[PDB]
């Protein structure tokens, strides 16, 4: 009854790292984008195994249901059927990134094992939606009010950077010397 919490851990920990290699190494980006839901669901499977029932149910809603749907719309909008496959562009700088990523991984594993953690043998989660909500309005209140300011700004900014300029695309507003519409006035010039 406990080995079925170990077998379902390693079957979820291998569900993420084979999907995390899928979102990075796969040759097609739509097959790469759909597997990102495989990362976000399997990671949400681990949060239930780590006694985090609310943080898992809040991850399928945001990461799989909102972010991953946002990724898929933002890839069906850009396909364009022009990959041009210039794989040997300038150099073999994709092997230099395999050394820093393997370097950080061997660096972190040496840190993880030898560091004495003070793990406690107490039973966790006394109904962790009640003790997570008495944190939002006592201690974590000012990060909770700044999350509202961050999200409103993220809607003002992401609308004005992606909307269509159908109000006035040919608008010569004024002039001392000439400026194009919706561009910074420092015109490009080569010395």
């Amino acid at each position: 009854a406990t080995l079925t919490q170990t077998i379902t851990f390693f079957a979820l920990a291998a569900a993420v790292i084979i999907a995390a290699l899928g979102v990075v190494l796969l040759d097609n980006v739509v097959y790469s984008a759909f597997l990102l839901g495989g990362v976000f669901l399997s990671i949400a499977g681990l949060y239930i195994l780590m006694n985090a029932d609310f943080v898992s149910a809040a991850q399928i809603l945001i990461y799989v249901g909102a972010v991953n749907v946002l990724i898929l719309f933002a890839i069906m909008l850009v396909n364009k059927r022009e990959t041009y496959t210039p794989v040997p562009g300038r150099w073999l700088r994709q092997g230099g990134a395999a050394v820093v990523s393997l370097g950080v991984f061997a660096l972190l594993t040496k840190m993880i094992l030898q560091t004495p953690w003070q793990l406690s043998s107490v039973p966790p989660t006394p109904d962790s939606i009640t003790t997570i909500g008495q944190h939002f309005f006592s201690d974590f209140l000012l990060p909770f009010e700044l999350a509202s300011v961050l999200l409103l700004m993220a809607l003002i900014g992401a609308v004005v950077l992606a909307r269509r300029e159908l109000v006035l695309e040919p608008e010569p507003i004024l002039g001392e010397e000439v400026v194009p519409p919706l561009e910074l006035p420092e015109r490009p010039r080569e010395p």
């Binding site: 309005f137 609308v159 992606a162």
Partner: protein, 100 residues
């Protein structure tokens, strides 16, 4: 330790409902014999307003569950979160974001 109660049947029901399509599509496997979408940025724009409002819903679920054990000061503070993200909603109508 696993002090969540009620999740013993969740791992079994996850497998059996997953065995509903993979076995039925195999039970049917033994019985059977100018391409443009236009780039219209509204599929992105309807999905951006989801993410800003799928996160607002998540932040109010600890408030709604633990409401009647918190009080009025946690309702004034939780009204600032709603009243600011209403201004995000009026911004989306007025700037023709969710027009379609």
């Amino acid at each position: 330790v696993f002090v969540l109660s009620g999740y013993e049947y969740f791992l079994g029901f996850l497998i059996i409902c997953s065995l509903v399509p993979v076995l039925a599509l195999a039970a049917s496997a033994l019985l059977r014999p100018g391409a443009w979408i236009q780039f219209n940025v509204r599929y992105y724009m309807f999905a951006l307003v989801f993410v800003i409002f799928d996160v607002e819903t998540v932040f109010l679920y600890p408030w709604a569950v633990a409401f009647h054990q918190l009080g009025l000061l946690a309702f004034i503070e939780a009204l600032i979160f709603i009243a600011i993200l209403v201004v995000a909603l009026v911004y989306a109508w007025r700037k023709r974001a969710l027009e379609w």
